[PDB]
């Protein structure tokens, strides 16, 4: 999968099946933290990046030891006799080396709302989440990234944050925090900031453009008329009931609504089966890379629909970037790297990134943040 | 045919699976599921270990499909897998297919493998894509189209895992067309259902599990008399029960069927669950938990408490192994099942496969004449083995489940093309 | 301690190598066998289904390496490795070690693990390099370090399999200063030879496969009695030979030691054998082979014709498949082996196994004072299974078995350091 | 490891246990046959490309269907129940199918010497394979590419090849066939020609230079004291009984004597072990890359040896097809793939390729090559 993850899994079997993975295996752990050191410097030619071809650049001082010991404190996970460190597992320790590693700080916290603020596509529902996050956005940027595309309409999205925005409606505008927040919707093409009253205004095209790389009309438009005739030919190739949206730089195959059985509810949607909805977007890809063009873009699978969107997340993430005058070794991006088969753009060449699978596993994560 | 004679692995462990992909608190959405199921150094190993004859499919259609021939005439292909699949239902054991898949089961029919992958081909046209073979899951929906096809006499009973088809989310039973369907089919062959929840002899606690289904009941199976044959089966093997004339639970006399039950000694119960519960005290205290015990007459449960805490998927694991090991150590060979839900952990002295086996001599019908609709993404092979008892159906939600039973309800019908994917489409 | 309790699989078949790395005429020289066990998608499965105490061991120095530590002090990692083959060796089974290697055998002795690797380290020190990690050789020969280290009480019987150690390419032996080492070994201990060539009772046969290393005992070991010390099982456990004062075998009287072997009715041997006959018939008819068959008294072999004609290795393996799924299918149990020898296959009513085991009881030696030479790379664990009755150290060239009975000969000397790679240097 | 190979096992494994792999396949093997032929034409975007990444380029119609069924009729592979078909035999097939796709026919065949004509280190010793290569001397030209060095020195690569130029001067003046015999040595440093008396000659540098990337000699230098340097570390740091042994263009770790048993021959080479001559092989490889440096050049482990080459095989190969005007359609290489662990250079790229792995196998390649 993440490669360093399965990096690290194999090394604690060994210690596992070993039998000493629960003694002071300090000599390995530390051995390892140097190697992880001598990454953060001389990144080009570490022992490591021979080891791991995809380690990409690190971007700070990993505590992968300290983070172990802190982990394995409060779970014991050295103290099971049979079911070895798994997967998810060092996914959280290098979440927790990570955020240690920020100990100099961060200035800017950027979320991907479709993987952790919506539950299953729904609007921001969590108090609890909330207060975190409003806790932090007094020490620090918080931005959110979505790939719903409404334009530049501040009031649609402000509909899928309004709980958040309420919260801060109480917590957040004595102090003057609401600055800090930022919202960039259609992954890098509409950025609101937040207002007095805790709500969504559009941040002006002309004042951010200089900070991204301009894309031609016509190539954005080529880029949605070949995903045209591919949804086309897939909705021939496969019987779909289901028609094209068309948006200004966004284009989707979206499922009719068809009727049910008479005792459940009389409409619901069609279903497009996974495999199809795959086999959809990387003929996109296909497509897209025969013209050989450069502009970023993503096209993904997402529940019972297909988007294709002119901009990835990874170029918001610059943009903000360079928008507030901050580099990479002090942000970090909380997002879900289950949620995309699609490697292309893995948010980790731009900022440190942590993944998390819940809003359990995402709280953790930000209480570690906020003791710091 | 009997419990001695099913290949049950009662203190056996599967592969550690590293990736926890039975985790439904970090794979929790039906887009990771399809996610795993892509990337084969995650999700193999597990996935042939849950079906290996499903896993035996997938593997030579990727292979007609590299070879870029999927979408011209297979026929040479399926016809001769149909052939080894007709030869391993005249030798179940001894047979080709059984040399290359010795955990392949029994086939109590004759599966139209061909006819199978045509009918799903010709309404969804996998064979069309260029980009994507064939899936577990499109094997999975082929292979239950061609035992529902096999059904040439019919069915005189049908049985669900409710734990793993019935209870939306681990709540009671909550929808009114699948209760419509299984109503209409109890009219026509006798219907069980079985779970590991043990209430002890309670009935009306596992009534109140079942209470909407039951209730559906009596609107429309009491005047024509299908309510007698409707079966619970509650503790995987301990607790049967009926149906009266007022849709009420009732017990049956324990005469009337434990002879059809493989006898345990009632020290070898209790020991069982006491060497559980000193287990499970000390996975309590090792780990730190907030969660209690919960034992039954013959079963015993670690459950989370209330706040709902959670408790650790691996410790959870960790506790399975721990107790089949002590019980192991104890040299008891009685059956019994220790599973890791998803958020608790139980041992029930008893076990699902003997369960139905219960209900097919007790109903007195033959095998060729059984179905049961479960979950193998919810269970383990180890505890109930695939193909052992009857035909079995893999569903993974209710749209899958209520598709099924229409095509059971329309059985033989000529004017009807299978469907275990869509209900509505 | 019996044959029934050693776990042989006479008719079971090892997972397909669909490289064919035991094929010799592909295979054919240390440079490419050394090159296979690099690449793990080549050689895994292979290597550790002929030892997976080795292979395990090979994973945990994998990740020692590429975690960069195992240059520094990893004795934290050997010395619990340590302390779970001394475990073992307490607790055959139901041992820590035992539940994550089930084949793991048995351990008559204390092996000091952390000794060997740092004996082994310091001269060849593996740990100095930054790009390749310990490989399976090496901790071969770091186990048979382990082993040899291990024999503080000595030794009173070493055996050796014929066929894998002592014949080169399958010769007449043909070694000085092999033979030397065993003779003066002889003056210290038993010596017992085991072969699958049967000759039928005639020692005349045999004597020429050994007829060097016998005219080596006529000139250092009639004096000193020591010749009465050797013993030579033909037929893999079927005739046993012993030495005069001439330096001759003779054949020992089947009474003297027929008891120690598991009876095989006459009928059940001719069986074997007849059905072998009849598929090897079909198999040299299906391919069109220019071999011969080459039937014994309680053997049967398939051969090539001399013009040598060279029978296709996978039409090689192919028919020992086919002869074991027809004794299978005609309900034999009795021990045999039907091996693919590398240019020839061989059907043996016989076993080196229980060789062994007639070998132990018969010179009444305890199992801790026995030590087998062989190589595992040119035989199935399941013909002859790991660590089964003895101590085995694993030799693939006469250096590597001249260095270890230099080392046994200088057993438990102070001032000698083991060697198990090197003779001269 | 080689990826097509294990395309075509893996195929055939599925048609195996789906038991259907001796009934009629063509269906699968002509629909992998167009796959290869649509991969002769448009090599750079076919279907191929996509499922086998590194495929390379075909210069040929492989007749992949004809050639398991002539393979099939021979063997009989398909007859068997237990043993589909394996790794061994898919390199038998390909290595057949290469031959028949040049029914156009080849104009020059090429032999790695070290792999396929000296068994075992020795020199040439197989009156039955000098027969088959005298044979189509007569219809092609025949060149010999060996690591040996020995400068331009004619009369030590004679004795390397005395037998087989013995049969030259019995069978190959008349018709004036030894014309057509060409040795490369030094990988690619020292060419040779055969005259009427079937002695070899060389042709001066002079003669052949223009089809040679020229390689300035203090890089040449640079390269051997790189890996002189290295050596000696590797001397040091595993206690070796061997010293460094620099030519022209190439430089080797060579095993110093050492005593044996008195019993046993008295003298013998030191033994170095597989494992450190491989770490040596590419430690250098890395400190070459370290250095930037451009030249192609050679480093492999050799039986009881290592040898750093300034030239590689590959470029010789290119070299004599450049200086025969020849290309590549009308020439292949014979050699054995399971001697270089080292993937670099693996001549498919510059010519057909024959995989072979003992004389027998490579009797049989030639026999089918003369039925054309
Ligand atoms: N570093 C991490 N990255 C991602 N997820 C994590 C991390 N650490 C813990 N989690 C997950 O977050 C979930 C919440 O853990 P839990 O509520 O037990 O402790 P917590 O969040 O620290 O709360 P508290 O501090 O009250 O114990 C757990 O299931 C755990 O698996
Ligand atoms: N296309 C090929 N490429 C490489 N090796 C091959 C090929 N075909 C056959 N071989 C190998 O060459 C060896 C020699 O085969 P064999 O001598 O049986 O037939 P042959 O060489 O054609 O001789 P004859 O024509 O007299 O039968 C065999 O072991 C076979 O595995």
């Given at each position: 999968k993440d490669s360093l993850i399965m990096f690290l899994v194999e090394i604690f079997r060994s210690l596992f099946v070993s039998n000493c993975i629960d003694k002071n295996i300090d000599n390995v752990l530390l051995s390892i933290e140097e190697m992880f050191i001598d990454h953060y410097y001389n990144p080009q030619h570490s022992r490591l990046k021979y080891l791991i071809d995809d380690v990409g650049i690190f971007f700070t001082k990993l505590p992968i030891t300290k983070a172990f010991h802190t982990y394995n404190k409060k779970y014991?996970?050295?103290?099971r006799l049979y079911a070895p460190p798994t997967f998810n597992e060092v996914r959280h320790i290098l979440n927790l080396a990570q955020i240690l590693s920020l100990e100099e700080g961060l200035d800017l916290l950027t979320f991907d709302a479709d993987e952790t603020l919506y539950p299953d596509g729904h609007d921001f529902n969590d108090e609890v989440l909330a207060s975190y996050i409003s806790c932090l956005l007094k020490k620090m940027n918080i931005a959110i990234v979505t790939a719903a595309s409404y334009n530049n309409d501040a009031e649609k999205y402000q509909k899928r944050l309004e709980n958040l925005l309420k919260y801060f409606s109480k917590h957040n505008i004595k102090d003057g925090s609401y600055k800090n927040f930022y919202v960039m919707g259609g992954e890098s093409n509409y950025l609101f900031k937040c207002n007095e009253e805790a709500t969504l205004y559009s941040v002006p095209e002309n004042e951010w453009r200089h900070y991204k790389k301009f894309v031609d009309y016509d190539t954005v438009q080529e880029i949605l008329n070949i995903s045209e005739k591919c949804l086309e030919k897939v909705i021939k190739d496969f019987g779909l009931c289901a028609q094209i949206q068309r948006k200004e730089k966004s284009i989707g195959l979206v499922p009719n609504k068809i009727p049910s059985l008479n005792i459940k509810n009389e409409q619901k949607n069609y279903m497009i089966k996974y495999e199809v909805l795959e086999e959809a977007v990387i003929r996109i890809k296909k497509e897209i890379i025969k013209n050989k063009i450069t502009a970023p873009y993503c096209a993904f699978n997402g529940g019972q629909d297909l988007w294709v969107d002119v901009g990835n997340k990874a170029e918001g993430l610059l943009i903000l970037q360079k928008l507030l005058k901050?580099?990479?070794?002090?942000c970090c991006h909380i997002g879900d790297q289950f949620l995309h088969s699609g490697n292309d753009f893995p948010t980790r060449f731009c900022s440190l990134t942590l993944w998390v699978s819940n809003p359990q596993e995402t709280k953790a994560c930000l209480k570690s943040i906020m003791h710091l």
């Open positions: 014991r996970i050295t103290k901050i580099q990479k070794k002090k």
